[PDB]
Write a protein that binds this ligand. Structure first.
Ligand SMILES: Cc1cc2nc3c(=O)[nH]c(=O)nc-3n(C[C@H](O)[C@H](O)[C@H](O)COP(=O)(O)OP(=O)(O)OC[C@H]3O[C@@H](n4cnc5c(N)ncnc54)[C@H](O)[C@@H]3O)c2cc1C
Ligand SMILES: Nc1nc2c(c(=O)[nH]1)N[C@H]1C(S)=C(S)[C@@H](COP(=O)(O)O)O[C@H]1N2
Ligand code: MOS
Ligand code: FES
Ligand code: FES
Ligand SMILES: [Ca+2]
Lengths: 450, 760
């Protein structure tokens, strides 16, 4: 199987024999030593590389990206960030002038992220570089550098890649997919690859029978529907975030702290749901907003409410040959409010994720959608709490009196992220939070300005 | 050139991805790759070791065990041995037991997972308490130092505070992981590695191979980060590559994959600190009694000097008439702890800062005045001493703090914060000032030496070579500046070459913030021999006196005539005058006795202070640093740009230590936090939103290279201020002692908020 892509301006055709090899290894094996390996798990950014295609250009972690994925795209690494004649990119010179590097080892990844941001003129630095760790500089000088280079015409040589292209199964349509999966129930379906690549790089696994969903345009659509929005499984977390900025700011704000921009750019909601991790951040939110999920097997097509998809820790309502095809969201939910609690704000796994949706009949509580991740082997509504809440008045004290029911809805774990006591106490704290916030009170540490 | 804010010698190379680190070096096609098989038991005898499935794993060429080691099996930087491969028993989860060489890194890792090992488990020591119970320790008993009589002083004290608190460890998290490469070289070997201490690598490989030192050469051009984590844990990889290489006849490379790195290597020692401190009615301290329990891991490594350094700093920034320290170095079955920026300093210092704060809350006094009242006296009959007996003749803290408090707008801001708190019920702001006093030099005295070698070629360009290693701190740029300043020429004519034990021998680790102080002297010593030879030559030629020959800015001047540095050099060449020179420097005035805890172990102290302001969420503990203002003393800095940069980076590293960074082990000894996804260093948005750093610019009193002061480690202690601020915020939520423990994670801040709120 042969693929093609542009590499740092040059056309490249490659014989894939192992479809699981990561982009990071192919590269270092070709001598493109400039992309570094700092963790090989998606957290450090040190392997960041820039891809481009019709949707445009973005920065992603080469260690999470297997080869097949870059077919038909343009790829830019740190060695190709400079112009062909050797002129440095405005971001490179700025890093030199402002001392944005010390040991140098995270410098490439920073430069590539920075260059990608510069190419689309994005300026939300804290979010764009969250996923690039630097242990030496304190970050300050890297910010000065980004600021300083922002007033510079974009690199022309980088945009010229736009004009480009104009073993393992690679479906082009949902139909082709459905057909084939149905025949190979046991296959390993790879979308973003952000949870699967850790099976090969860390668990040292080997996966035969593999299919990549990232080339099914029809699986990655956002369709306006009569009664909501239909979100394809292959939609990336980044894209879902962009859409949500309008109709679902709360979910949008949540997705802000979903991994890093680099992972968001390729991870999918379908994947976040199919992985079925009780610490997924997607599920709790969606359940609080009462969305629905759509499975599919050949031409068949079930359709339950999201929360019902999760049976037990590590086990889902999924049939041999069956795959997730989309989820559906209501056109609105102003009651939604999402809370994530971790040791660090950016790029961390939740100790607890709290999603709350309360509808009111003036002062009275009509409906109560309350979801949690990381409180149990599965994401789930807090029934007894929800229940006791109906009909009661929406004041802090009523909520204060129902908290204990949470200790009946869940019995959290203890582990390196947090103690059971803390988890518990935090689920309860999220509830106080919600009233206080809706009642217009200052509650968020991240909104405090110096 | 000294004094100018010039970029790191490798800025452009960093920014274009041209800079090479160890794993980027080109190597022969036949190079093997290595990986260790690790113990899954915290403590046990090994009973069976079936390696057959390993030998049969694809791509594997050789497999090794302690019995294959041809000679020494010992990676320790200290007199007691630490095997490289397990000898019949294991002592922690992670100890390497066998070694695989395969034709690829993956193939090595994979094979390293297929052994069948049987163990005979034994009771494991994992907690300080267990350690104390069992009397598991190093140095057969605690170390105790005492000045005057504490119990007497604390019995008669108007005010008093007793307390106990944990301080967790810290993982280095150098972005480039441990790594090394060994190439057979007819008779001997050449090792390339990523280490702060190539002479030790040389020493340990030689012993592992049965070779005299002169048959092993170590080169090292740059590390992507060290922070003390590569002072010694480089020894295992190098030993392993050398041994594999000797046996297979081929070049051998080993890099740890991240998870392995965190499970095998050491971390900053965690401490438990118990204190009693007391004062006068006016607020002058009367005495302080501390007990230190330090978790060291299964082997001594650098625990000794580390714990000595904590004792040496238990006085923090204050004069204390009576003081006692009783220091336990507790052996347990976990990763053997090691150096980390600060090297004991921060633990002992943080011990006294906590105390004094506790004292201050107790007497309802403002922590800042109490501190300010007890700083050692300014300089310029009988100078005050430290508890180890060293005159403190350079304390500028008084002036400095004052100056920082004004520039920082301290007083006003404190009120703005009080107001703001009273109006809020869910959030609370906090602010604190914290000072720093850190001694410079290794406390093992004889490591305070450094060498260099310099060459001028006939076109006038210069190659400088010294014993320190570059790990991002700008050492190389600073030595470039010292040489260009001492020879009178432009820096661009000076080129730095890789650290190499065959050019400057018997070096010490680059550490203890002594890299630039000592290598700078050595570089100057060499450059001065050269200049002397050139002046002597210009003087005889132009008939006049050497001291009247001027070198400046690429020009030489004598008897009214003037010439380019190159022409002087070409003529010196024709006249047969050697253009090559070594240089050496031994820090003077040092001497002290560890056991008695008396002497002058430091040349001088570095100082600084920081004021940090943060906010916390009273419901969950979530929190963040809003603003920091720092004022730090780097002497007459050699490069203020590079200094400001160390300071910023060290600040974030320290606060990282005391907030999100947390190590956790499970009931059986396994490290649970062993990957960036579970061990959390400060991330980009964690930086302070307002970050003001400034240098105090006053030459050092002592004769250091251009009167500068080391700036690498000291600044890491400024992070205490952030912890002190987190605690100020807790203290505002209630009337009780918050007893905030370190690391101040959100779970921990929440616990301290509750104690203060009296909700348990
Ligand atoms: C550094 C880092 C940070 C992260 N942070 C977060 C975070 O904060 N929050 C969070 O929730 N997660 C986080 N994750 C994991 C998260 O689930 C994944 O990043 C992602 O959402 C899964 O998307 P994906 O397409 O890459 O899943 P994939 O890796 O492609 O795998 C999906 C899993 O489900 C299967 N699958 C994929 N698509 C389908 C389909 N449509 N139908 C049926 N099965 C399918 C796959 O075979 C695999 O089992 C993080 C991961 C990393 C690397
Ligand atoms: N950028 C960067 N700076 C750093 C480190 C590092 O690993 N990277 N190590 C520190 C440690 S532990 C020391 S001891 C000093 C050493 O600097 P020096 O050579 O000037 O003494 O640099 C400090 N600054
Ligand atoms: O920690 Mo610096 O002494 S290597
Ligand atoms: S190596 Fe760290 S994110 Fe890829
Ligand atoms: S400069 Fe060393 S990690 Fe960024
Ligand atoms: Ca380490």
């Amino acid at each position: 199987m042969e693929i093609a892509f542009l590499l740092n301006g040059e056309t490249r055709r490659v014989r894939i024999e192992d479809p699981t090899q990561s982009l990071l290894e192919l590269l270092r094996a070709e001598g493109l030593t400039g992309t570094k390996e700092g963790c090989n798990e998606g957290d450090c950014g040190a392997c960041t590389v820039m891809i481009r295609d019709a949707a445009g250009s973005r920065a992603v972690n080469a260690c999470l990206m297997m080869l097949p994925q870059i077919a038909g795209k343009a790829l830019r690494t740190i060695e190709g960030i400079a112009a062909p004649d050797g002129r440095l990119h405005p971001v490179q010179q700025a890093m030199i002038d402002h001392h944005g590097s010390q040991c140098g080892f995270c410098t490439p990844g920073f430069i590539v992220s920075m260059a990608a941001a510069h190419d689309r003129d994005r300026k939300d630095y804290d979010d764009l570089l969250a996923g690039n760790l630097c242990r030496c500089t304190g970050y300050a000088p890297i910010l000065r550098a980004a600021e300083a280079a922002a007033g510079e015409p974009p690199a022309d040589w980088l945009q010229a890649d736009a004009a480009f292209t104009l073993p393992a199964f690679l479906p082009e349509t949902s139909d082709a997919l459905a057909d084939w999966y149905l025949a190979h129930p046991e296959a390993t379906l790879i979308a973003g690859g952000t949870d699967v690549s850790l099976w090969v790089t860390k668990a040292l696994r080997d996966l035969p029978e593999v299919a990549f969903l990232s080339h099914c345009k029809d699986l990655a659509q956002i369709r306006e529907t009569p009664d909501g929005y239909g979100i394809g499984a292959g939609v990336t977390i980044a894209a879902l975030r962009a859409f949500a900025e309008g109709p679902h700011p709360a979910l949008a704000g949540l997705l802000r702290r979903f991994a890093s921009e680099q992972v968001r750019q390729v991870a999918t909601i379908g994947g976040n749901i199919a992985n079925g991790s009780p610490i997924g951040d997607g599920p709790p939110a969606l359940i609080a907003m009462g969305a629905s999920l759509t499975l599919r097997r050949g031409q068949e097509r079930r359709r339950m409410p999201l929360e019902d998809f999760f049976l037990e820790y590590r086990k889902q309502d999924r049939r041999p040959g069956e795959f997730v095809e989309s989820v559906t969201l209501p056109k609105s939910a102003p009651g939604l409010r999402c809370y994530k609690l971790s040791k660090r704000f950016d790029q961390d796994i939740s100790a607890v994720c709290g999603c709350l949706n309360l509808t009111l009949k003036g002062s009275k509580i009509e409906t109560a959608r309350i979801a949690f991740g990381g409180m149990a082997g599965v994401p789930k509504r807090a029934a007894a709490f929800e229940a006791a809440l109906i009909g009661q008045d929406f004041r802090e004290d009523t909520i204060a009196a129902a908290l204990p029911l949470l200790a009946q809805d869940f019995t959290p774990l203890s582990d390196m992220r947090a103690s059971a006591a803390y988890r518990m106490n935090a689920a309860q704290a999220m509830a106080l939070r919600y009233v206080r916030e809706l009642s217009g009170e200052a509650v968020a540490v991240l909104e405090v300005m110096p | 050139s000294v004094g100018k804010p010039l970029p790191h010698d490798s800025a452009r190379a960093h920014v274009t991805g041209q800079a090479r680190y160890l794993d980027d070096l080109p190597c022969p096609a036949n190079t093997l790759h290595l990986a260790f098989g690790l113990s899954t038991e915290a403590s046990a005898a090994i009973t069976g070791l079936d390696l057959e499935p390993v030998r049969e794993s694809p791509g594997v060429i050789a497999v090794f065990t302690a019995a294959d080691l041809p000679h020494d099996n010992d990676a320790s930087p200290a007199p007691s041995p630490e095997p490289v491969l397990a000898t019949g028993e294991v002592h922690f989860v992670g100890q390497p037991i066998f070694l695989v060489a395969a034709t690829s890194h993956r193939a090595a890792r994979i094979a390293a997972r297929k052994a069948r090992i049987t163990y005979a488990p034994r009771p494991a020591i994992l907690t300080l308490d267990q350690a104390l119970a069992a009397d598991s320790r190093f140095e057969g008993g605690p170390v105790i130092w005492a000045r005057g009589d504490v119990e007497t002083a604390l019995a008669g004290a108007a005010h008093l505070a007793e307390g106990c608190f944990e301080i967790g460890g810290q993982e280095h998290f150098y972005l480039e992981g441990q790594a090394a490469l060994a190439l057979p070289a007819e008779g001997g070997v050449v090792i390339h590695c990523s280490s702060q201490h190539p002479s030790e690598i040389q020493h340990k490989v030689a012993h592992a191979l049965g070779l005299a030192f002169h048959d092993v050469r170590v080169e090292m051009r740059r590390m992507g980060g060290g922070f003390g984590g590569k002072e010694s844990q480089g020894n295992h990889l190098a030993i392993a590559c050398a041994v594999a290489a000797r046996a297979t006849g081929r070049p051998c490379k080993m890099r740890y994959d991240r998870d392995d790195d965190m499970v095998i290597t050491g971390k900053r020692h965690d401490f438990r600190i118990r204190y009693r401190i007391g004062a006068d009615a006016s607020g002058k301290l009367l005495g302080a009694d501390f007990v230190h329990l330090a978790r060291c891991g299964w082997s001594a490594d650098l625990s000794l000097p580390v714990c000595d350094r904590a004792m040496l700093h238990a006085d923090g920034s204050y004069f204390v008439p009576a003081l006692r320290i009783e220091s336990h170095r507790l052996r347990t079955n976990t990763q053997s702890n090691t150096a980390f920026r600060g090297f004991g300093g921060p633990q002992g210092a943080l011990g006294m800062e906590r105390a004094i704060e506790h004292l201050a809350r107790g007497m309802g006094r403002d922590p800042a005045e109490l501190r300010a009242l007890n700083f050692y006296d300014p300089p310029e009959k009988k100078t005050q001493t430290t508890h180890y007996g060293q005159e403190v003749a350079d304390c500028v803290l008084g002036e400095l703090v004052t100056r920082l408090q004004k520039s920082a707008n301290f007083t006003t801001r404190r009120a703005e914060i009080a107001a703001w708190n009273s109006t809020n019920r869910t959030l609370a702001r906090g602010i604190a000032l914290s000072p720093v006093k850190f001694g410079i030099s290794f406390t093992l005295t004889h490591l305070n030496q450094a060498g260099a070698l310099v060459q001028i070629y006939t076109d006038g360009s210069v190659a400088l070579n010294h014993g320190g290693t570059e790990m991002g701190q700008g050492l190389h740029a600073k030595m470039v500046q010292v040489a260009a300043a001492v020879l009178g020429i432009d820096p661009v004519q000076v080129r730095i070459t890789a650290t190499d034990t065959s050019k400057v021998p018997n070096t010490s680790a680059t550490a203890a913030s002594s890299g630039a102080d000592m290598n700078g002297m050595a570089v100057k010593d060499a450059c001065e021999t050269l200049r002397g030879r050139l002046a002597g030559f210009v003087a005889a030629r132009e008939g006049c006196a050497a001291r009247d020959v001027i070198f400046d800015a690429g020009q030489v001047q004598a008897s009214g005539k003037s010439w380019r540095f190159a022409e002087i050099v070409a003529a010196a060449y024709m006249a047969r005058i050697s253009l090559s020179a070594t240089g050496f420097y031994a820090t003077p005035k040092l001497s002290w006795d560890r056991l008695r805890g008396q002497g002058r172990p430091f040349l001088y102290f570095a100082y600084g202070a920081a004021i940090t302001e943060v906010v916390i969420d009273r419901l969950t503990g979530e929190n963040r640093i809003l603003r920091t203002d720092i004022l730090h003393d780097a002497g007459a800095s050699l490069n203020p740009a590079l200094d400001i940069g160390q300071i910023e980076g060290a600040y974030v590293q320290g606060a990282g230590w005391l907030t999100t960074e947390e190590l956790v082990w499970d009931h059986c000894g396994r490290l649970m936090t062993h990957a960036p996804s579970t061990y959390k260093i400060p991330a980009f948005s964690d930086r302070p939103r307002i970050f003001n750093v400034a240098l105090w610019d006053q030459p050092n009193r002592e004769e250091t290279i251009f009167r500068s002061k080391a700036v690498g480690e000291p600044p890491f202690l400024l992070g205490i201020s952030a912890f002190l601020a987190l605690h100020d915020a807790c203290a505002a939520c209630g009337p009780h002692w918050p007893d905030l423990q370190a690391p101040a994670t959100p779970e921990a801040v929440l616990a301290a908020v509750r104690r203060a709120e009296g909700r348990a």
